[PDB]
Amino acid sequence: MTKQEKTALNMARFIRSQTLTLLEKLNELDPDEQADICESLHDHADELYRSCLARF
Amino acid sequence: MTKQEKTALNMARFIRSQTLTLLEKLNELDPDEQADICESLHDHADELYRSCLARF
């Protein structure tokens, strides 16, 4: 296994883990809170994405 | 401190932590990989957001 392959697998595992935990955590809040948090998370995701576009 | 307050603080801390780790991890990849991962992460973020809209 190459370092590039090992890295790719590790990153895939990491993103999967983060997503699973986030979903489980969100599932603890009532509908109202969930909607607010989701709206905030999406706006922040767009901001991070635009920052990446700027870097590349 | 109310349970609602304790929950809000815990969620804020969690989202902050996840973001910091993600950024640090991304910083390990070369420009090319970073761009690919960012594009994939954004598309997935949009998918999750649309799923939330559907639930609420």
Swiss-Prot record, chains A, B:
GO molecular function, one term: identical protein binding
A Pfam short name: Rop
Gene3D superfamilies xrefs: 1.10.287.230
Keywords (A to Z) from UniProt: Plasmid, Transcription, Transcription regulation
Transmembrane segments: none
Job description of the protein: Regulates plasmid DNA replication by modulating the initiation of transcription of the primer RNA precursor. Processing of the precursor of the primer, RNAII, is inhibited by hydrogen bonding of RNAII to its complementary sequence in RNAI. ROP increases the affinity of RNAI for RNAII and thus decreases the rate of replication initiation events.
Protein name: Regulatory protein rop
Gene expressing this chain: rop
